[PDB]
Amino acid sequence: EVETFAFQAEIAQLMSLIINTFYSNKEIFLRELISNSSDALDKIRYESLTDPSKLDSGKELHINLIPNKQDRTLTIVDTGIGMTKADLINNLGTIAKSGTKAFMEALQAGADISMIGQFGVGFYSAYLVAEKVTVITKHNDDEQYAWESSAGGSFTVRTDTGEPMGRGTKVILHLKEDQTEYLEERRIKEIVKKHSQFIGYPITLFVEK
Numbered sequence: 001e002v003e004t005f006a007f008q009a010e011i012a013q014l015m016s017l018i019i020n021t022f023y024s025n026k027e028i029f030l031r032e033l034i035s036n037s038s039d040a041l042d043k044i045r046y047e048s049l050t051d052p053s054k055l056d057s058g059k060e061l062h063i064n065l066i067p068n069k070q071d072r073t074l075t076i077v078d079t080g081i082g083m084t085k086a087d088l089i090n091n092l093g094t095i096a097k098s099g100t101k102a103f104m105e106a107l108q109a110g111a112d113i114s115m116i117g118q119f120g121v122g123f124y125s126a127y128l129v130a131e132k133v134t135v136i137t138k139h140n141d142d143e144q145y146a147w148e149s150s151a152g153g154s155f156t157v158r159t160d161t162g163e164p165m166g167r168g169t170k171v172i173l174h175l176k177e178d179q180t181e182y183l184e185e186r187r188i189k190e191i192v193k194k195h196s197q198f199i200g201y202p203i204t205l206f207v208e209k
């Protein structure tokens with residue numbers, strides 16, 4: 001049972017700008033997704049300070065980067081707070097309508113796409129490199145869900161029957177054909193060292209057979 005939703009017009013406009021603007025510095029998508037994971041991990045950590053049972057769904061707070069050249073996917077996994085179904089539908093837990101408004105004003109007033117995270121909509125930078133994004137998520141207060149979008153104005157949400165996650169979020173980037181450098185170990189390591197050196201959770205880059 002799959003539900004299909006229209007993006008709000010402002011979010012569809014954001015996504016088309018990300019996909020269509022000529023902008024070479026695409027590697028910042030990974031910094032933005034790692035930053036979102038860190039924020040989600042901070043949230044569950046804070047809740048656990050007054051209620052240890054919040055970690056019954058998993059005590060480890062970490063970020064995993066999983067490249068898969070056969071599937072042409074890069075997956076970013078975190079064990080943060082996760083998202084409810086309502087969060088997924090409401091722009092993956094963001095205030096994306098107001099954030100987009102500000103971001104697009106900044107772009108006309110000098111800024112560039114790399115600054116997207118300052119507007120709370122850094123998730124959508126995934127579309128710099130991915131033709132399709134799948135988000136699998138599990139929040140303590142809800143069931144496990146899969147969100148997916150290839151842009152084009154719509155997204156889907158369904159209950160996820162796949163491998164149970166415990167708690168957190170998995171962002172699966174189905175990479176564009178010309179963006180496979182982001183599956184190479186040395187390239188990922190370079191990006192993490194350049195942009196994510198001060199993230200306060202372990203970031204493990206998985207290797208492939």
Ligand SMILES: Cc1ccc(-c2ccn(CC(=O)O)n2)cc1
Nearest residue numbers: 017018021023107113114116125
């Ligand atoms: C990730 C990203 C990439 C591009 C933009 C952006 C902003 C304004 N434009 C179009 C223009 O050049 O006027 N494109 C925003 C975010």
